[PDB]
Ligand binder design. Structure first.
Ligand SMILES: [Mg+2]
Ligand SMILES: [Mg+2]
Ligand SMILES: [Mg+2]
Ligand SMILES: [Mg+2]
Ligand SMILES: [Mg+2]
Ligand SMILES: [Mg+2]
Ligand SMILES: [Mg+2]
Ligand SMILES: [Mg+2]
Ligand SMILES: [Mg+2]
Ligand SMILES: [Mg+2]
Ligand SMILES: [Mg+2]
Ligand SMILES: [Mg+2]
Ligand SMILES: [Mg+2]
Ligand SMILES: [Mg+2]
Ligand SMILES: [Mg+2]
Ligand SMILES: [Mg+2]
Ligand SMILES: [Mg+2]
Ligand SMILES: [Mg+2]
Ligand SMILES: [Mg+2]
Ligand SMILES: [Mg+2]
Ligand SMILES: [Mg+2]
Ligand SMILES: [Mg+2]
Ligand SMILES: [Mg+2]
Ligand SMILES: [Mg+2]
Ligand SMILES: [Mg+2]
Ligand SMILES: [Mg+2]
Ligand SMILES: [Mg+2]
Ligand SMILES: [Mg+2]
Ligand SMILES: [Mg+2]
Ligand SMILES: [Mg+2]
Ligand SMILES: [Mg+2]
Ligand SMILES: [Mg+2]
Ligand SMILES: [Mg+2]
Ligand SMILES: [Mg+2]
Ligand SMILES: [Mg+2]
Ligand SMILES: [Mg+2]
Ligand SMILES: [Mg+2]
Ligand SMILES: [Mg+2]
Ligand SMILES: [Mg+2]
Ligand SMILES: [Mg+2]
Ligand SMILES: [Mg+2]
Ligand SMILES: [Mg+2]
Ligand SMILES: [Mg+2]
Ligand SMILES: [Mg+2]
Ligand SMILES: [Mg+2]
Ligand SMILES: [Mg+2]
Ligand SMILES: [Mg+2]
Ligand SMILES: [Mg+2]
Ligand SMILES: [Mg+2]
Ligand SMILES: [Mg+2]
Ligand SMILES: [Mg+2]
Ligand SMILES: [Mg+2]
Ligand SMILES: [Mg+2]
Ligand SMILES: [Mg+2]
Ligand SMILES: [Mg+2]
Ligand SMILES: [Mg+2]
Ligand SMILES: [Mg+2]
Ligand SMILES: [Mg+2]
Ligand SMILES: [Mg+2]
Ligand SMILES: [Mg+2]
Ligand SMILES: [Mg+2]
Ligand SMILES: [Mg+2]
Ligand SMILES: [Mg+2]
Ligand SMILES: [Mg+2]
Ligand SMILES: [Mg+2]
Ligand SMILES: [Mg+2]
Ligand SMILES: [Mg+2]
Ligand SMILES: [Mg+2]
Ligand SMILES: [Mg+2]
Ligand SMILES: [Mg+2]
Ligand SMILES: [Mg+2]
Ligand SMILES: [Mg+2]
Ligand SMILES: [Mg+2]
Ligand SMILES: [Mg+2]
Ligand SMILES: [Mg+2]
Ligand SMILES: [Mg+2]
Ligand SMILES: [Mg+2]
Ligand SMILES: [Mg+2]
Ligand SMILES: [Mg+2]
Ligand SMILES: [Mg+2]
Ligand SMILES: [Mg+2]
Ligand SMILES: [Mg+2]
Ligand SMILES: [Mg+2]
Ligand SMILES: [Mg+2]
Ligand SMILES: [Mg+2]
Ligand SMILES: [Mg+2]
Ligand SMILES: [Mg+2]
Ligand SMILES: [Mg+2]
Ligand SMILES: [Mg+2]
Ligand SMILES: [Mg+2]
Ligand SMILES: [Mg+2]
Ligand SMILES: [Mg+2]
Ligand SMILES: [Mg+2]
Ligand SMILES: [Mg+2]
Ligand SMILES: [Mg+2]
Ligand SMILES: [Mg+2]
Ligand SMILES: [Mg+2]
Ligand SMILES: [Mg+2]
Ligand SMILES: [Mg+2]
Ligand SMILES: [Mg+2]
Ligand SMILES: [Mg+2]
Ligand SMILES: [Mg+2]
Ligand SMILES: [Mg+2]
Ligand SMILES: [Mg+2]
Ligand SMILES: [Mg+2]
Ligand SMILES: [Mg+2]
Ligand SMILES: [Mg+2]
Ligand SMILES: [Mg+2]
Ligand SMILES: [Mg+2]
Ligand SMILES: [Mg+2]
Ligand SMILES: [Mg+2]
Ligand SMILES: [Mg+2]
Ligand SMILES: [Mg+2]
Ligand SMILES: [Mg+2]
Ligand SMILES: [Mg+2]
Ligand SMILES: [Mg+2]
Ligand SMILES: [Mg+2]
Ligand SMILES: [Mg+2]
Ligand SMILES: [Mg+2]
Ligand SMILES: [Mg+2]
Ligand SMILES: [Mg+2]
Ligand SMILES: [Mg+2]
Ligand SMILES: [Mg+2]
Ligand SMILES: [Mg+2]
Ligand SMILES: [Mg+2]
Ligand SMILES: [Mg+2]
Ligand SMILES: [Mg+2]
Lengths: 155, 386
RNA sequence: AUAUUGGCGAGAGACCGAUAGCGAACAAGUACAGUGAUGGAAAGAUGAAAAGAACUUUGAAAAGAGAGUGAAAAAGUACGUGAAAUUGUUGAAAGGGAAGGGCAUUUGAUCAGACAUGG
RNA sequence: GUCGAAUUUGGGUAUAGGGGCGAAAGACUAAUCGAACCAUCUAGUAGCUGGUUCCUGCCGAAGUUUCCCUCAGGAUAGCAG
RNA sequence: AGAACUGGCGAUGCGGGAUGAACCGAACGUAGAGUUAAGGUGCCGGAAUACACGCUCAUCAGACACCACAAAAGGUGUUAG
RNA sequence: GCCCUGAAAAUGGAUGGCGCUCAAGCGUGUUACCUAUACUCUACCGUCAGGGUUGAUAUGAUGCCCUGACGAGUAGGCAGGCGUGGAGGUCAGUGACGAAGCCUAGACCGUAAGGUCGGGUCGAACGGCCUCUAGUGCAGAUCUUGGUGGUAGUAGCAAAUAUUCAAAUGAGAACUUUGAAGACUGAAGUGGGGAAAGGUUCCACGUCAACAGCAGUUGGACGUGGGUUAGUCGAUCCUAAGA
RNA sequence: GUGAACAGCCUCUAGUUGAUAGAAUAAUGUAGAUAAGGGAAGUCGGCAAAAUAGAUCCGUAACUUCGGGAUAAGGAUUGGC
RNA sequence: AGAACUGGUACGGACAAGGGGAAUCUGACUGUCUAAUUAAAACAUAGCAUUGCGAUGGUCAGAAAGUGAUGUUGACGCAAU
RNA sequence: CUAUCUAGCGAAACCACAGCCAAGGGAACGGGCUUGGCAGAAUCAGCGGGGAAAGAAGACCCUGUUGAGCUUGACUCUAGU
RNA sequence: GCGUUGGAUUGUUCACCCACUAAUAGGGAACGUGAGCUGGGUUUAGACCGUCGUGAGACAGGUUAGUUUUACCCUACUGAU
RNA sequence: UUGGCGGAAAGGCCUUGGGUGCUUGCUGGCGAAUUGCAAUGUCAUUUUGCGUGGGGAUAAAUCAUUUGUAUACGACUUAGA
């Protein structure tokens, strides 16, 4: 309860959250944006064949010095990747929304992801040992994910 | 400040940028000056580089230690099946340079050529020139009046020919298509000649001939990213130098405070377009012939293909040009052969050669035998056979 | 009669208000450091009341989504208010080797000051 | 390099800071040595470097004189309010 | 490098000198209309490709104070004396 | 006089640029034209000066009013004001019917310091005026404490020969367990015990939030338990350098 | 086992197979090798690298503190049966 | 130790394992040190020489002492260079 | 074996604002100013020209009425004798 | 426009010889060029001599030994989408 | 609608034969106001979405896989109904 800005009709839609998840914030962001606005099954099937390395996730912000792939051509892009742990968690959340959408009587076949939004959770903090008896931070940058599925409108 | 000693710079600034070509088919950037008084001519010719071998022949060079003596030279054999004309293109003079005005295509286009226009031939609906041919159907007009305008405009006429790549051992089924300038008289007589040669064949011996110097336009064998030492030639830095020694030490003076366009940096080597000139024709091969590799002296019935096939290429079953020395590009790669842009009286250029012997031993190893006939006529009988 | 930054019992202040006031408002001379002498922190606030979310559903679980408690969950033992840097999303805009500023107006957005006369 | 001794080394024991210990390098004396470490005197002193927090109105300088172990500083007069 | 009188810069923006502490003009509350200064008016650029008499042709012309240099020496170029 | 020679330097470049040859060059003359925060007139702000005016005559005598002149400013002096914590006095001041605080290319007032309001958020307090008082105003001090960026999903996670098939278990298996294969340490050991030191790490069962810089169902981790048996092994006795 | 051997190399008992992993094999590296002809011309300098090497049997200079110098140098040989 | 036979003349076949010679400067040698930029020609050393001292003493320690090192010593000794 | 590309994991230096040149002037070597050349998203691997790059409030030198280690017929003293 | 070299001694720039050659021109680019090398010289700390100094120490006098750090950022340059 | 001409970027030009609206070459019959004395009063052409009806056509590219004439990654080059 109490999500980011939304314009969806709450009645034709249900939602899902994940907080404090130990996935990469930068990376899940890049994949969340990737399915943002997709029809649920389209998005679901794509994320599934990202894992299979048949196509990729465009990296458009947190992306410098990333490799170039042939698989980015689809999205007019040279840098893409296949961030499994991100896909995985995001998959997880797409499920639960799909779950909640069905318990709500929303027609599975009219669901697109109307909202998907990862910002960053509190950092975990580990030590690394650097030369000349020094210590440095070695932090995890966890993610909050949230998303919403909605029924497409007759028009 | 003023280098302690002088040396000439490394590398040639006239072959920049040392980047990869933008077509594996090197561009003929120049054609010969037209003499519109001679018959209608092809100016260049397509072909596939097949490999090299050795030659023997008496040198005719009055005043040389080696005059009237036998020399042994290296040659390259380029696989040259007849090419086929499938159109003619018309170029008009402008104050902005030559301009293609129209192109007119033949009515029937071989599958090889058609393949060239596709990226995914196999799953295609092969609709390549299907509507274009219809222009022919209506008795003429359409085509008839485009040849008409190439005739009244157009300062230069090129033909569109394509290789019959399938005659080649090459696996590539897609063929090679190129414009070739016509150099016989009068625009009109040119497009006429092209019209009449639609779907028809043209062979080398109708363009080139023995003792003729020709130029070779091909794309250099690539090598990918190269360090500065081999790429530019650059001295090796001493053994003791930290952080590597296949470098150059002083990438620049303090001022200009910019690495300069003219110092050696690592990058691509190979896969460049080169126009190599003055390669003299030692043999024009006939495919029908079975004495391709034979000689007035060495009479034995053998073809040009070495024992075991040209390595990484196959057998020469077609016509071929055999040229003195080496030409740019590697085996399997398309070459354009252009006739010279000038009339060289070099005396070397004018020498008429007669081959005395063509090496036909295996190249896949330290070959010992010219013909399997000869092998067996020396080895004896083996455990196999008889 | 005089002294009194110690000890015990008290009454007070135009003192400080959790980076302040004693180092310590808290299991503070604690946790931790150092062979040792010594050094020495951080750390207060759900709600009147736990009424600390029965139950259902998704999940391997953590949790999510409903439901429920409450004046409030825009108070969920991460908990009063919850600023800034910095961040995700959405919306508008601009962008030929920085951005930002001054005077001026186009354009778009936005906001005004009315005051009262006969049926 | 040396490798059967002026050998290597465990534990115990002794020497403690203007002191030790030194086959001598100002070496070593707990990552500290041309004087260890700890706390206190101690908010040590600085003619030198750095910073010094709101608005508007009005007036508005000096780098020159004299003396100074004076020359990156003061006193004195001038200029200023 | 060091003195002399005055005016500046420093402490001062503004118009000119492309540029710039110190030159020229001119010193400053918020503004309107006018006129100017020094400097400019082919175009960049507001403002006569104005008027008038000469001079100059450079296979290294020349083009404005401070100021971004030039000399002894020489020419049957051309002009006037 | 103008022009020519005399006249040689280092990235490519400078009458400011373009470009200009009866000039857009040089010398001279004559007109017009453009333009400063300067000059002229006027409004308004302030400063200073000079006056007028409470005789009884609704609400400012330190006030009202008339007139003239003037306005650069560092270091610096002075004046008048803005704002904060706390104190005396007064508005019988605001407030759970919403105090304070915070958010707001919404509004108004002031040259300004600032002041006032609306909307959202909030939830127990808090203002104005006269006065008192000071631990009273930050952009800087390689300032103090804390918190956060770009760097960046980047540097990197490459010493120490080497792993592979299959089953089991599990939500999940490159990494756990069993089986097989391939290998290593090669007794100067990667074997079997100990001294110093640690202090439960030992063993069993359960078990993965954190930690083991991939992973984890495994662990020297987490939870809960269990375990160290002496006349003869040591200490204990003795003396050593020393204390 | 080899061997002079507690060297190196391979093995038995025991113990491990633990050091993120996958795909590629550009430049430049780090570590390991080779190079025709010449042979220190490289360089401050043979730095680095190369060459020699066990054993048996011959042979062995100046000098000398008579002990040495000396594996001086320089040669031949080496399996299996 | 010797002999025959045998081989693509190989055979310490992996492993293991000195390059040599002629000289100048310098320290005799073995040994020592700047832990973490100097291993050396520097320190040490045997050897040589000097100095002081017969105990109510030489050299040295302690604030002082019925205090202490040499000294469980005695000039073939101790101390100092 | 790296680098490289992938999954997971994931720091640090440094950071006025930043990042194309030529000339001019200028605190006498500009990323910014003046006049010109010019100038088109977003990017990957390399590189050592420049960022008068980064790393320490310059060890050099001077100044300071600032030291300390050491030496001496400096000044002034002192254990001892 | 195009070239301007191979060597002996020296850390050297310079110098000076041998030798080849068409010629072995002179200069700049932060006395171009150390996150490009090298570290021979110079100029920390060890050490020998000589001169100087009573001494501690000094000496563009001779001598020997003496740690050469970071790029992953921007730009530039090379190549690549 | 009949002929021609135009390729420098022709994308336009000349010409034939009618049809048809207008004709201010000329002579008539009406109409205009109150839009209140200017403001404010002809609408030009770009695109881009939809809408009617008429003619018309019925493909590839990328991912993946594959070649090695290519290659750090992308990219390149082949192949597959
Ligand atoms: Mg949350
Ligand atoms: Mg980023
Ligand atoms: Mg990288
Ligand atoms: Mg980058
Ligand atoms: Mg991209
Ligand atoms: Mg580390
Ligand atoms: Mg350590
Ligand atoms: Mg030169
Ligand atoms: Mg190379
Ligand atoms: Mg070559
Ligand atoms: Mg090195
Ligand atoms: Mg061959
Ligand atoms: Mg009490
Ligand atoms: Mg506190
Ligand atoms: Mg604070
Ligand atoms: Mg505290
Ligand atoms: Mg301490
Ligand atoms: Mg509270
Ligand atoms: Mg709190
Ligand atoms: Mg729950
Ligand atoms: Mg509330
Ligand atoms: Mg609350
Ligand atoms: Mg709870
Ligand atoms: Mg809260
Ligand atoms: Mg965020
Ligand atoms: Mg209105
Ligand atoms: Mg010393
Ligand atoms: Mg120490
Ligand atoms: Mg320490
Ligand atoms: Mg103080
Ligand atoms: Mg004044
Ligand atoms: Mg005076
Ligand atoms: Mg005095
Ligand atoms: Mg000063
Ligand atoms: Mg003046
Ligand atoms: Mg000053
Ligand atoms: Mg002025
Ligand atoms: Mg000027
Ligand atoms: Mg004047
Ligand atoms: Mg201009
Ligand atoms: Mg004008
Ligand atoms: Mg002339
Ligand atoms: Mg003058
Ligand atoms: Mg004259
Ligand atoms: Mg000259
Ligand atoms: Mg000039
Ligand atoms: Mg003149
Ligand atoms: Mg004039
Ligand atoms: Mg005049
Ligand atoms: Mg004039
Ligand atoms: Mg004015
Ligand atoms: Mg003023
Ligand atoms: Mg006040
Ligand atoms: Mg007030
Ligand atoms: Mg107050
Ligand atoms: Mg206070
Ligand atoms: Mg704001
Ligand atoms: Mg409120
Ligand atoms: Mg409350
Ligand atoms: Mg007051
Ligand atoms: Mg204060
Ligand atoms: Mg601050
Ligand atoms: Mg600051
Ligand atoms: Mg990551
Ligand atoms: Mg990486
Ligand atoms: Mg590493
Ligand atoms: Mg390993
Ligand atoms: Mg398996
Ligand atoms: Mg493994
Ligand atoms: Mg083994
Ligand atoms: Mg061993
Ligand atoms: Mg267990
Ligand atoms: Mg881990
Ligand atoms: Mg884990
Ligand atoms: Mg346990
Ligand atoms: Mg073990
Ligand atoms: Mg590791
Ligand atoms: Mg090998
Ligand atoms: Mg060789
Ligand atoms: Mg030799
Ligand atoms: Mg040399
Ligand atoms: Mg030499
Ligand atoms: Mg030397
Ligand atoms: Mg040397
Ligand atoms: Mg060596
Ligand atoms: Mg070798
Ligand atoms: Mg060899
Ligand atoms: Mg002897
Ligand atoms: Mg034998
Ligand atoms: Mg010598
Ligand atoms: Mg010695
Ligand atoms: Mg020795
Ligand atoms: Mg050392
Ligand atoms: Mg040594
Ligand atoms: Mg050493
Ligand atoms: Mg002697
Ligand atoms: Mg990665
Ligand atoms: Mg940076
Ligand atoms: Mg510049
Ligand atoms: Mg210049
Ligand atoms: Mg200029
Ligand atoms: Mg300069
Ligand atoms: Mg700069
Ligand atoms: Mg300016
Ligand atoms: Mg500019
Ligand atoms: Mg650089
Ligand atoms: Mg840097
Ligand atoms: Mg000194
Ligand atoms: Mg003084
Ligand atoms: Mg003094
Ligand atoms: Mg001193
Ligand atoms: Mg000292
Ligand atoms: Mg004395
Ligand atoms: Mg004396
Ligand atoms: Mg110079
Ligand atoms: Mg230099
Ligand atoms: Mg450099
Ligand atoms: Mg360096
Ligand atoms: Mg050096
Ligand atoms: Mg040196
Ligand atoms: Mg020294
Ligand atoms: Mg030396
Ligand atoms: Mg050494
Ligand atoms: Mg970096
Ligand atoms: Mg009509
Ligand atoms: Mg009007
Ligand atoms: Mg390959």
């Amino acid at each position: 309860a109490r999500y980011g800005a939304t314009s969806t009709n709450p009645a034709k839609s249900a939602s899902a959250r994940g907080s404090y998840l130990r996935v990469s914030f930068k990376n899940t962001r890049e994949t969340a944006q990737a399915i943002n606005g997709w029809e649920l099954t389209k998005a679901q099937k794509y994320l599934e064949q990202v894992l299979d390395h048949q196509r990729a996730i465009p990296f458009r912000r947190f992306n410098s010095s990333i490799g170039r792939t042939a698989q980015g051509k689809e999205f007019g892009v040279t840098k893409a990747r296949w961030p499994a742990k991100s896909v995985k968690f995001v998959q997880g959340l797409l499920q639960n929304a799909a779950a909640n959408a069905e318990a709500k009587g929303l027609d599975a076949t009219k669901l697109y992801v109307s909202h998907i939004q990862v910002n960053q959770a509190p950092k975990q903090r580990r030590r690394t040992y650097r030369a000349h008896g020094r210590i440095n931070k070695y932090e995890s940058s966890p993610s909050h994910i949230e998303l919403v599925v909605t029924e497409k409108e007759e028009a | 400040s003023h280098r302690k000693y002088e040396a000439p710079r490394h590398g040639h600034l006239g072959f920049l940028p040392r980047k990869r070509a933008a077509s594996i088919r090197a561009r003929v950037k120049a054609f010969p000056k037209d003499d519109r008084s001679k018959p209608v001519a092809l100016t260049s010719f397509l072909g596939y580089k097949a490999g090299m071998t050795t030659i023997v022949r008496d040198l005719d060079r009055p005043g040389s230690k080696f005059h009237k003596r036998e020399v042994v030279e290296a040659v390259t054999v380029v696989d040259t099946p007849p090419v086929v004309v499938v159109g003619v293109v018309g170029y008009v003079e402008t104050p902005r340079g030559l301009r293609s005005l129209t192109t007119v295509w033949a009515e029937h286009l071989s599958d090889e050529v058609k393949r060239r226009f596709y990226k995914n031939w196999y799953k295609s609906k092969k609709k390549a020139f299907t509507k274009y041919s219809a222009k022919y159907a209506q008795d003429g007009a359409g085509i008839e009046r485009e040849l008409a305008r190439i005739k009244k405009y157009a300062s230069v006429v090129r033909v569109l020919v394509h290789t019959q790549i399938r005659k080649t051992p090459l696996a590539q089924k897609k063929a090679h298509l190129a414009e070739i300038q016509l150099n016989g008289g009068s625009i009109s007589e040119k497009v006429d000649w092209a019209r009449e040669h639609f779907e028809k064949t043209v062979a080398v011996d109708s363009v080139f001939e023995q003792n003729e110097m020709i130029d070779a336009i091909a794309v250099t064998k690539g090598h990918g990213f190269e360090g500065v030492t081999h790429r530019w030639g650059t001295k090796k830095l001493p053994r003791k130098t930290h952080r590597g020694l296949r470098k150059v030490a002083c990438i620049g003076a303090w001022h200009p405070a910019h690495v300069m366009w003219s110092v050696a940096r690592a990058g691509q080597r190979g896969y460049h377009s080169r126009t190599s000139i003055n390669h003299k024709i030692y043999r024009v091969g006939k495919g029908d012939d079975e004495a391709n590799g034979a000689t007035s002296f060495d009479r034995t019935k053998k073809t040009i293909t070495p024992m075991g096939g040209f390595v990484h290429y196959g057998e020469i079953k077609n016509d071929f040009i055999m040229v003195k020395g080496c030409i740019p590009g590697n085996r399997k790669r398309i070459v354009t052969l252009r006739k010279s842009l000038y009339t060289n009286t070099s005396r070397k250029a004018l020498e008429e050669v007669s081959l005395k012997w063509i090496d036909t031993a295996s190249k896949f190893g330290k070959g010992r035998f010219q013909t399997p006939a000869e092998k067996h006529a020396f080895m004896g009988t083996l455990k196999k056979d008889l």
